[PDB]
Design a protein around this ligand. Structure first.
Ligand SMILES: Cc1cc2nc3c(=O)[nH]c(=O)nc-3n(C[C@H](O)[C@H](O)[C@H](O)COP(=O)(O)OP(=O)(O)OC[C@H]3O[C@@H](n4cnc5c(N)ncnc54)[C@H](O)[C@@H]3O)c2cc1C
Length: 456
């Protein structure tokens, strides 16, 4: 990367906001997954959207790849600089704007995390529900199409992103639903907002997101429920969903995950396949939801609910940290994760089969999942130096992905494709799907410089 080019970057954002130092590049060459660190040639911190546009135009016209970087909590290698280039760390733009409490909407810049937003919203009666376990950039969550424990009731990022501000690869500024616009529904033109949600930085740089806010629940109750078997826990889940109980959160942990979370968070739950549950409503609605849900879990052998502000907070913090709880089972390990999502009636077969396949292998695996969406993760720890053990892990991961595709499902419910699931995506949508996605990539990024090597 030439010295004239670095000086051009410094001319846009300022000398302190450009770095070519090896350590700084290495910190921006990986995310939270096992994908090997591939450091960008430089890291740049633009201070406003005009600077994002000018950095993008400089890179694009000089044939230099661009890698958008949020909080680096992704798990599919989205930020790995597989072709080098310039990593654009967006987190110094961290302002919340256009809070419209009467319209239940807000605009956030990439440095805003869900915890910052919900702190800002305290005493408003509103909250933002989409809750990945990591305190991630909200614009990064828009870019990956994230979901969370609350999505079963309150929707994913796709459901709660109203508008996006995007710097296209050549620097043009696009407001996907129109500048400043926010509304509940529209048929105006093609829906550009949904194209950029889940685009993982391959179609442009999200520089603000307009988010749907939700009313805080009148009352909340959380509980855990222990089951004699995975089959029993997942049958309960399916039957709760088919009974249309509007549960706010329904999270599955197998016994391995439960034990790991106990050891990592000082929970003391019985070591068993377990549901973490939460219910929202008034006192009447809560009592109704509870006995309909307790009736179903009892039929499948569930324990009486172990009830849990401080105690629910610890419960859900433990769940949100399950990734790190799994990693702490084998210190020094990194992890790959599966993320399949299947039609809910097929969830019992595939979870039980996955548990059986983990047992029949030499592999350490913890299962945790947004099973209310028919989604779950198998977190697979790896010795970073054990090459034979890594080939067994992606081999297991590909096979699980192909089993989900065989059931009519998808290889990723929320984490995305990045580097790891590109072959599965080709199988999932077929040749016409792949070519159509590639034609969209090509019109927005003709030179192929927008986070190359990812998704397609
Ligand atoms: C402990 C833990 C728990 C998690 N739980 C969940 C969960 O429940 N659900 C879930 O969906 N994910 C979960 N994740 C994954 C991760 O937090 C999400 O994918 C999150 O959306 C990543 O945001 P980020 O800014 O950290 O991404 P990064 O790693 O910085 O980037 C992710 C991808 O998006 C691109 N990108 C980032 N910001 C932008 C931007 N502004 N514009 C364009 N492209 C951009 C990057 O180029 C990359 O390809 C979890 C991760 C951890 C470590």
């Amino acid at each position: 990367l030439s010295q004239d080019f670095v000086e051009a970057l410094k001319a846009v954002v300022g000398s302190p906001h450009v770095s070519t130092a090896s350590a700084v590049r290495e910190q921006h060459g990986h995310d939270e997954s096992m994908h090997r660190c591939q450091p960008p040639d430089a890291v740049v911190w633009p201070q406003n959207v005009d600077q994002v546009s000018r950095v993008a135009s400089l890179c694009y016209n000089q044939g230099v790849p661009i890698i958008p970087f949020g909080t680096g909590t992704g798990v599919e290698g989205g930020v790995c600089a597989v072709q080098g280039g310039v990593c654009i760390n967006l987190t110094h733009m961290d302002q919340i704007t256009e809070l419209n409490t009467e319209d239940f909407s807000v605009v956030v810049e990439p440095g805003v995390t869900r915890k910052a937003l919900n702190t800002h919203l305290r005493d408003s009666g509103l909250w933002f529900p989409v809750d990945p376990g990591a305190d991630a950039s909200l614009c990064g969550m828009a870019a990956t199409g994230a979901s969370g424990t609350n999505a079963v009731r309150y929707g994913t990022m796709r459901d709660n992103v109203i508008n996006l501000e995007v710097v296209l690869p050549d620097g043009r500024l696009l407001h996907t639903a129109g500048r400043g616009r926010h509304y509940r529904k529209s048929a105006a033109g093609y829906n550009l907002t949904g194209l950029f949600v889940g685009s993982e930085g391959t179609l442009g740089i999200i520089t603000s997101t307009t988010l749907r806010l939700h009313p805080a629940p009148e009352a909340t109750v959380a509980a855990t429920c222990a089951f004699p078997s995975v089959q029993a826990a997942v049958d309960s889940t399916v039957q709760i969903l088919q009974a249309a109980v509007p549960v706010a959160r329904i999270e599955f942990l197998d016994d391995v995950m439960m034990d790991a979370c106990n050891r990592h968070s000082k929970l003391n739950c019985p070591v068993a396949p377990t549901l973490f549950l939460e219910f929202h409503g008034s006192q009447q609605t809560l009592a109704e939801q509870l006995q309909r849900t307790e009736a179903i879990t009892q039929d499948n052998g569930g324990s009486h609910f172990s009830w849990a502000a401080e105690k629910r907070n610890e419960l859900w913090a433990a769940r949100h940290n399950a990734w790190y709880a799994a990693l702490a089972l084998s210190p020094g390990s990194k992890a790959y994760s599966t993320d399949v999502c299947v039609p809910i009636s097929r969830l019992p077969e595939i979870l039980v089969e996955t548990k059986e396949e983990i047992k029949a292998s030499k592999l350490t695996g913890a299962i945790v999942g947004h099973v209310g969406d028919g989604n779950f993760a198998c977190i697979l720890l790896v010795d970073p130096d054990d090459a034979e053990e890594q080939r067994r892990v992606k081999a297991f991961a590909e096979n699980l992905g192909r089993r989900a595709l065989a059931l009519g499902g998808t290889c990723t419910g929320e984490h995305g494709i990045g580097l790891g699931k590109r072959q599965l995506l080709q199988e999932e949508v077929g040749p016409v799907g792949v070519e159509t996605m590639r034609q969209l990539k090509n019109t927005l990024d003709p030179r192929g410089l927008m986070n190359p090597g990812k998704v397609l």
